[PDB]
Amino acid sequence: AVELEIDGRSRIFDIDDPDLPKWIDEEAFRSDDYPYKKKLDREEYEETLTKLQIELVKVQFWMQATGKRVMAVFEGRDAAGKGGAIHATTANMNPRSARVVALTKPTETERGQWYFQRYVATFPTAGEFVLFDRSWYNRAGVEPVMGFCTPDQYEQFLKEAPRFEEMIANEGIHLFKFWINIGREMQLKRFHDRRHDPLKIWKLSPMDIAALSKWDDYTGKRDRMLKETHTEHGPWAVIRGNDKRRSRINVIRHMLTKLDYDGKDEAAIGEVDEKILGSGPGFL
Template identity: 45%
Template sequence: MSKKEKKTKGIGKENYKTSLQRLQLELVKLQRHLIRNDLQILIIFEGRDAAGKDGVIKRITEHLSPRETRVVALGKPSDRELRSWYFERYVAHLPSSQEMVLMNRSWYNRAGVERVMGYCSETEYENFMKSVVPFEQMLLGSGMQIYKYYLDISKDEQKRRLRDRRVDPLKQWKISPIDEVAIEHWDDYSKARDAMFRRTHTEISPWYVVKADDKKTARLNIIGHLMSLVDCPDKDKHAEQPDAEIVFPFDEIYLHNNIIAP
């Protein structure tokens, strides 16, 4: 059995807090570097419902300046947006100079939720899949840095988390009609995800898969992985190196050996 197939070991509360604080200090260094050099960073988080996107974003932004950090989580498109160029509503939220934007779901909604739930036509889906890579290349060519993470969880773990949402009054704001059918459409979401990976994972804009059944381990590794990618002269290269068995670039073989949840 591959090591990536093994369940991640939970991390103790104190070790987690210490590691998280150390990584959050690195994020502050990154933000200073971003502001000083007029950079633009876009971080996209995708994944199944209850995969842990909210929690990761909260830990990344917790100690960053809100003036230069934005979280984008768009709701249902308006009638006007439905009649507009698909990417238009997202373009308005892209990072400007000296800014970091974290998207809790993104234009890849069309490749996932919209595809599975029938919210877009086959033509709209194909137009998106053909245009998203050139669109990202254009953004990258303008100097924007883009990092794409897909949080991968098992079916059993999704069931448990969705069940927790229904009974925890502090989590019930997360409940949506999509949640109610997430498990029912598990296989459909898997097929849509696989097609998205195959057609939108590129050398200059790769997808990074995160094994996220253990939330704390996933959070630490995502932040560590992000810091390993960015060019920040002040960063501590020895701080919490990411585990390559937790965060790794997509590869077709992972769809056939259960490293990515089938």
């Protein structure tokens, strides 16, 4: 079990415990000042998603004609729900043009290269929607927190990421960056859900469990990054992710509003929820 300190109070969390203790279970949803008291009605979420998806088919037909290229980054804490936001957007997309980049950790050869090199290799050709599991922003989160990269390297990445993204925007590739937020209790509940589901247990490693008393360590790095890497060229979208249903819908609503695609049905997109989707610093 892990000794913690949740907003002033010292707490005891056993992940191998098949029982979720009261202060996680009852707190998880509202954690981190989540704006809503319960989950989105499911029927209503599913019928919204279908509509958003039918839109995303319009997008991809338009992408194939204009040759328009789109890139989509998803970052967040462990279990913030990057993958479910990714699978929501691509589930009913053509995997020929919409592809998910899942890069393993750098090889030796990749380590002596320009950090951005292996990301460049995955960049879109005419018409491609490229989505990122892990992005070049491991250098602004996991790597300096875990000391997988030097301070100087992290510091260079913060400096180089906007020059990198100016190049992308100047090329006319449309980059989205989504930071997905969850409250501390949610992470714990989700971590626990993974542990006790034989279908999701491979997602945990002892490291992820060791790095639970590194919340603030990660809070620090999050805030540095968003201020320092949110440019006009590369804006950051920040999502409240406690409810995955709301997180998915607003991710897709945001992208749809931002892309000037043929056959765009504004009634079907609806309103990006101001309570859920923000911009850069000042939102969290």
